[PDB]
Design a protein around this ligand. Structure first.
Ligand code: ADP
Ligand code: ADP
Ligand code: ADP
Ligand code: ADP
Ligand code: MG
Ligand code: MG
Ligand code: MG
Lengths: 469, 57, 462, 462, 308
């Protein structure tokens, strides 16, 4: 073993003498088992960032080489497990037995290595799947204020991948550990845990672990991508990571800029989300979908860090605060939310039924803050709003979504009152699942919409049995 | 005349009710801009002081 | 154990040189004997090199001399825990400041420690029944949760704190801790005597980090109170209360320490370790499998700006807010909790029942409608209102009076004996008012009572 | 080949010790064999003293060890030029990344060089028809001139530059060059296949150093594409189109290396050499007597702040500017071009004619008064305006909507097919609006159409 | 905004018929203005009563740092040693502080707020407290004070306020309208503005002017959006008189004939008090606004209204 000695240390940043043959960005281990990262190789010394508790590290403390570039364990051993950014288990279910490892820092796929995103990743949420559809290999920002429903979108998306052969990675950065414990319990109850990896760096954890957490989760997702399988990564959230990286940069006395952040704060997120992609047929055809979170302050999307991540991702889902605290959940802002992939990420039936649905609702909300022609659009608008409302932890199959949206947009709920629309939807789908199952199964198998005349009769057949308030 | 006066004052209720709602909307927008500038000003001022001190040492 | 020499004294910072291979760990308490009697305690912060340790002082550095002996205690600031702390007033170092004799505790625990491990944590939200109708219904507290306490001077902030201590001790058997972060000495003396008079002194341990102490003392005083709260959770399985007044002054202290250590400032002049320091305090306040610590926290908002880093970082951890309004206190509505402005994360059909949520939202919608019509009623009159609104206004006024409550601590002020109202009784009472079962009763009947049965019982006496 | 030894590794910066007399010059390429296999190219920046050269790495420095051998190539980073680069995709080092075999090019030109001499320069005083109404009318581009597309996050810079590729570069007699600087790798993959299907690829050299890449690559990748464009201009006498998305990323990458080079920061944390670095790059992008370069550069605006040093300093290097604005984008006005902030050197009677100029300034006079009334209109609406201002506001809103236009590249988003409007039609349309000829028509008829005839036709079915 | 034009007018008005001696200190300002003032004092004959010192903005910081002390030492002699009154004119004292700020970091001093030296208040006080009257002699000191970025909260002018018995607060918004001298009627203050010194009528009229102008400022933001006719008859009359008062506060200066394009005017105090009193009482409500603009006495405003 090749040894070094700590000569200075403060705020989890150490200067080490020795370690002559050490690599830049190498994993190191101190006397007491705590890990470290060789950041800067100086002429006579080595700069070491401590990746854990530093209350037993001091001048005279010894540290050794591992001979390995900064890396984490990967593979099927992490499925259903809760880990920190180093891959060490926090759930207390024994060690992570694995031979496969991958580096924290890793190059993104090249220009020829990619293919255009053409495969749906169904969230199971009507508002998203219809208006802002996510595809396999896409990067879609989830952005909004505190308590606007960000994490719920991610967890419900993960729950909806049950039986779809998609590995999920929930990266918790700077969150309360209460909520991560709640998340893993929610996944256990909905049978979503056994295909999900949970990486967590809580608010009590030192800043370098918050910094590394997204890259560790990215590496875990990358393993499955490059072997031909599909994966989903969630960064909850990148505002905590950015703030954690700012702490590290200010402790290292690096020159601060806008909102005191360092000049490579855009590069922090840009290299992370570039590694999410849809690979070509030559490269196995696998993918990694990314859902990065940004938490705005007072709905300010024009701030430094929000505009950085909007500039990286393939569109965004903005969650409006005023809508969220007035019954409308999920509170998707149709005016500024968008999916760059769009129709290419949807099945044929969903694309045709909800083709102009986003701009129709954007027009409705404009007309709301303000005749006979426009009165019909307000009445239609109120009813479509009730359909896109949805309870938490209740994903809807895509065949059921398209039928529900088809009914409201073609005017099968105009004579029904606005307060009965949510019940009308629920009971219509019970009728459709039990009796008219061949119409739903046609959408499942092909992806295309059923016969127009046959579907119209099936809806009108149900309306005879229905009773309004 | 009395009916026209009722229409005048009702129309003034609505117009000035909207002007009140519009003023509160604008007052929030200005309060966001103010606190954006206040935070930016303190961040810049303290950064220049610390930069000036580090140049000596 | 390790012994060193003071090489520099620069305000509340003290550099101490130790011998080679025997240095104090970071956050270790280091005692220094004063030349003119007494002991200064300092906390190890940075290892500068050449076996020199920069330390943050917990008391005045005047009178210190270069070359004096400094003894490493071998651990962080360790403070007494258990039933010996109850009814006592402490400082940051865990020493009594009440002049009430010896504190015979069995153990002393270090104030610096990691948050609870993932495996220890509770996996679902549970209500903490305070027994106070307005809080439990409209903005309920969660076990292991954090509540933002807002309100002006003389609105019932101290009385509400004392009632929460009383009710949790009486019904749940959970003790309390009060942490005065930047306590004004006059107000600390008043609070001590006020808690003696009400009787809640015996259920609470008090810790003051007073205004006139150094930034290091006011930075770590919340951790001293927190450590006392942790004993009762971890050892005795209690649902503990932890009061922190003011949480901004904890952040302020961190910024002051950061400036003394010479760190580069972050946005809006705050310390770069803003989130880390707040998170390491707040994450320890949580619900474990054995018990919980629920924290009511008074929060100053700089320049009335909620996007400011101090409140913004604090609000990241909050689960609810208790907003006290002066206008309700002027009307005689005590506790003067704003039923529309106060909010809670756990007000949902998942945590509380479907009925609780329905009734709570119904109360809010009725009170919001009544609040909107105040300008219309004042000028145009009651005849301007429709038949639907007249009934809503009548029920809202009954609802607003039924939200008031006589407190065990406030028997001197109100005259009547105090009342603990369970959640089920609170839900049932406001449900029956919304359904219109008690429309014919007078409005004075709903004022200052416990359950809905006590309101009906009051109606015959009027 | 002179040998050197690594002394320090500091992010993208590497210090290398050479023997006395064999010191590499500034901007020279230096190769280092990795311990993990492969070669890392590195660029000499500063001479520190004691025969030590501080360098900037063109790729990752992870895995490097102190004492490794470094080979001075004896010249700057040199890249292929001429006909061999056409139809090919390159990286910062001039290596092919398209997997189409080797690039059989005769000459390798260095990416660093001085700007052209004063006598070589050629002024651009001729309009370039884009087919976009706002640009052509209010801030027209010049043939062989310098064009800048300013905008915040997600306002429409890439959609606009892709539309300009569609409208201008497809029916272009000469050659083309695209530079991907610090943007999405996916968009480079899209634009490759987009150009391959249309057949424009065969007259287009492409270079990519995207947001995945380390700062050294993002810093110098524009110079790689520029050197290829310089060869077509000077040696072959060609009319070249230079497309760059996004030039801000070159300045951003400069700030990242500047931090670890140890330079003292300037305003808003930027490098002190911001203006000089920008000028040394930009002044090479120009038309000469031998041939012309028509450059169209996307320019990112940090946090929508046009006073930020990066976009602020960029304004000096531009003949025409298209200033995109988030407010217009959120209103549905696409392209979201600010009609007053967007400017052009060739908007004068001598170039565009008297009618074009008069109509352009007439439009801006209407919009300027509409802009002045926004504070009043926001509060009180249009009810308290004078009869004169009511007409001005009515014409301004119609002008504002006729300035919008459906794009060929935006067919995938909106669903409407794209439109190409000639200059004569644009001048005629806004002239008729200024003369009150379409006061009868509703506002939505002017929104998202080509010619004024299409607005007349749209009004019928409305 | 008009510091140099004002101090030159005070030399023209006060120092012309002054029985005692004078001192002028040119501190970090334009050399053109030193030449202008010298030849102006030479023509009027005031040069024989006046010692002049110049250390202008062309000079290095050390010269601008100590030039005020050179002038002050000469003024201190005339105060203490000789039995005669002294007028001390300084333009501009800010440049002393700025000169100290230039050398501060090179002297090895860490910077204070707003780029200033940490010893701002101490350096200012040790210079300023020498500039004073004593039991031995009388110094009437008149100092021009630059306000950087029009920001009165700036450390330099903010610290200077403690050293003054009267302050003439110039504002750009008045100068932007053409109101010269651009004196803020509310923010300008004096220690001797009281009934004991200036009399009961003077104090009442002066206070009346301030209340009318204060009420006009409160209405400006209300009028701008909601309109003029929505006010009461009392407020409409207050707005009308405030604008006339504001224009009668303007005045043409003897030294500013090349800027105003008209002859300068001297107005006695008893005449000034009479003029504003009649405007408050409502005796000139039918005169137009331009009649009050750029005149001396109230009689000249009555004559000017006939031309319009
Ligand atoms: N569609 C929904 N219906 C009902 N409640 C919801 C819905 N989405 C979120 N919530 C609730 O609202 C709160 C905020 O959601 P969360 O995802 O925690 O927001 P954030 O992560 O942005 O703070 C949570 O308590 C959650 O249970
Ligand atoms: N629950 C209550 N019932 C009746 N009176 C109360 C109640 N709470 C407060 N008050 C009145 O308000 C006064 C101030 O209460 P206190 O808690 O000291 O306010 P603060 O701590 O905000 O200064 C008390 O002296 C008492 O008269
Ligand atoms: N001309 C346009 N028409 C319609 N939509 C547009 C147009 N330009 C931009 N957009 C919308 O804005 C999004 C972002 O555009 P983009 O060019 O990527 O912005 P930037 O490059 O400035 O970040 C697009 O995906 C699209 O939804
Ligand atoms: N009393 C005045 N009458 C007319 N114009 C004036 C007056 N005072 C200032 N100005 C105008 O403003 C200009 C600047 O005045 P000056 O005294 O040089 O400003 P500063 O406050 O910078 O010393 C003058 O040259 C003149 O044009
Ligand atoms: Mg969340
Ligand atoms: Mg772009
Ligand atoms: Mg001057």
């Amino acid at each position: 073993v090749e040894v070094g000695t700590v000569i200075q240390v403060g705020d989890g940043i150490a200067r080490v003498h020795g370690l002559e043959k050490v690599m830049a960005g190498e994993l190191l281990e101190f006397e007491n088992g705590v890990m470290g990262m060789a950041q800067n190789l100086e002429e006579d010394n080595v700069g070491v960032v401590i990746l854990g508790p530093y209350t037993e590290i001091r001048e005279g403390t010894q540290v050794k080489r591992t001979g390995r570039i900064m890396e984490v364990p990967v593979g099927e051993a992490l499925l259903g497990r809760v880990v920190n950014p180093l891959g060490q288990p926090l759930d207390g279910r024994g060690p992570i037995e694995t031979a496969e490892y991958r580096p924290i820092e890793s190059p993104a796929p090249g220009v020829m290595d990619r293919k255009s995103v053409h495969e749906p990743l169904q969230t199971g949420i009507k508002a998203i799947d219809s208006m802002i559809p996510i595809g396999r290999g896409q990067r879609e920002l989830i952005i909004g204020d505190r308590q606007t429903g960000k994490t719920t979108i991610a967890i419900d998306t993960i729950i909806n991948q049950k039986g779809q052969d998609v590995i999920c990675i929930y990266v918790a950065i700077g969150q309360k550990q209460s909520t991560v414990a709640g998340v893993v319990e929610t996944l256990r109850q909905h049978d979503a845990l056994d295909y999900t990896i949970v990486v967590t760096a809580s608010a009590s954890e030192p800043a370098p672990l918050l910094y590394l957490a997204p890259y560790a989760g990215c590496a875990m997702g990358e393993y499955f991508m490059y072997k031909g399988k599909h994966a989903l990564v969630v960064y909850d959230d990148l505002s905590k990571q950015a703030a954690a990286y700012r702490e590290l940069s200010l402790l290292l006395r690096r020159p601060p800029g806008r909102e005191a952040y360092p000049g490579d704060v855009f590069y922090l997120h840009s290299r992370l989300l570039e590694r999410a992609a849809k690979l070509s047929d030559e490269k196995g055809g696998g993918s990694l979908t990314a859902l990065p979170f940004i938490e705005t302050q007072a709905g300010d999307v024009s701030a430094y860090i929000p505009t950085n991540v909007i500039s990286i991702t393939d569109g965004q889902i903005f969650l409006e605060s005023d809508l969220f605290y007035s019954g409308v959940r999920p509170a998707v802002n149709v005016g500024i939310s968008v999916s760059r992939v769009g129709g290419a990420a949807q099945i044929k039936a969903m694309k045709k039924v909800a083709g102009t649905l986003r701009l129709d609702l954007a027009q409705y909300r404009e007309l709301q803050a303000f005749d006979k022609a426009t009165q019909a659009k307000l009445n239609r608008g109120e009813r479509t709003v009730e359909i896109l409302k949805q309870d938490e932890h209740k994903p809807m199959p895509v065949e059921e979504q398209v039928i529900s949206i088809y009914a409201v947009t073609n005017g099968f709920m105009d004579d029904i009152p606005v307060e009965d629309v949510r019940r009308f939807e629920e009971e219509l789908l019970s009728f459709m699942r039990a009796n008219k199952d061949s119409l739903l199964d046609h959408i499942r198998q092909t992806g295309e919409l059923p016969d127009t005349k046959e579907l119209d009769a099936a809806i009108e057949e149900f309306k005879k049995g229905f009773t309004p308030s | 005349l009395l009916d026209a006066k009722a229409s005048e004052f009702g129309a003034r209720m609505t117009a000035m009710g909207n002007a009140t709602d519009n003023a509160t909307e604008m007052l929030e927008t200005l309060t966001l801009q103010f606190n954006r500038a206040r935070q930016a000003a303190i961040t810049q001022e303290i950064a220049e002081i610390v930069a000036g001190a580090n140049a000596l040492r | 154990m390790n012994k060193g020499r003071i090489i520099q004294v620069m305000g509340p910072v003290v550099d101490i040189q130790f011998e080679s291979g025997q240095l104090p760990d970071i956050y270790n308490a280091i005692t220094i004997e004063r030349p003119q009697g007494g002991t200064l305690t300092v906390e190890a912060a940075v290892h500068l090199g050449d076996n020199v340790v920069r330390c943050v002082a917990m008391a005045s550095t005047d009178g210190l001399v270069r070359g004096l002996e400094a003894v490493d205690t071998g651990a962080p600031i360790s403070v007494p825990v258990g039933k010996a702390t109850l009814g006592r007033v402490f400082n940051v170092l865990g020493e009594p400041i009440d002049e009430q004799g010896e504190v015979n505790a069995e153990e002393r625990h270090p104030i610096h420690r990691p948050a609870p491990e993932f495996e220890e944590l509770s996996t679902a939200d549970e209500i903490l029944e305070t027994g106070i109708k307005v809080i439990d219904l409209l903005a309920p507290y969660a076990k292991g949760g954090k509540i933002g306490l807002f309100g002006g001077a003389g609105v019932g902030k101290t009385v509400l704190i004392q009632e929460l201590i009383n009710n949790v001790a009486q019904e749940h058997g959970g003790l309390s801790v009060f942490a005065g972060v930047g306590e004004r000495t006059r107000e600390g003396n008043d609070l001590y005597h006020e808690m003696k008079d009400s009787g809640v002194i015996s259920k609470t341990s008090m810790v003051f980090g007073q205004m006139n102490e150094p930034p290091g003392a006011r930075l770590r005083v919340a951790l001293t109170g927190l450590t006392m709260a942790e004993y009762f959770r971890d050892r005795e399985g209690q649902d503990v209360l932890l009061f922190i007044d003011n949480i901004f002054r904890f952040t302020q202290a961190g910024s002051e320490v950061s400036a003394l250590l010479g760190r580069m400032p972050s946005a809006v002049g705050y310390q770069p370790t803003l989130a880390t320091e707040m998170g390491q305090l707040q994450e320890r306040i949580t619900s474990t499998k054995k018990g919980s610590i629920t924290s009511i926290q008074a929060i100053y908002v700089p320049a009335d700006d909620y996007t400011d880093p101090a409140p913004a970082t604090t609000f990241a951890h909050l689960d609810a807010t208790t907003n006290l309004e002066r206008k309700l206190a002027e009307m005689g509505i005590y506790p003067a909790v704003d039923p529309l402005a106060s909010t809670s994360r756990i007000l949902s059909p998942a945590v509380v029942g479907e009925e609780h949520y329905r009734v709570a939202r119904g109360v809010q919608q009725v009170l919001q409608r009544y609040n909107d019509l105040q300008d219309i009623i004042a000028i145009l009159g009651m005849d301007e209102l429709s038949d639907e609104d007249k009934l809503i206004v009548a029920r809202a006024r009954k609802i607003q009076r039924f939200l008031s409550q006589p407190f065990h601590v406030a028997e001197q002020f109100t005259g009547m004996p105090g009342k603990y109202v369970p959640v089920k009784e609170t839900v049932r009472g406001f449900k029956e008012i919304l359904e219109g079962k008690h429309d014919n009763l007078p409005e004075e009947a709903f004022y200052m009572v416990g359950t809905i049965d006590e309101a009906v019982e009051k109606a015959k006496k009027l």
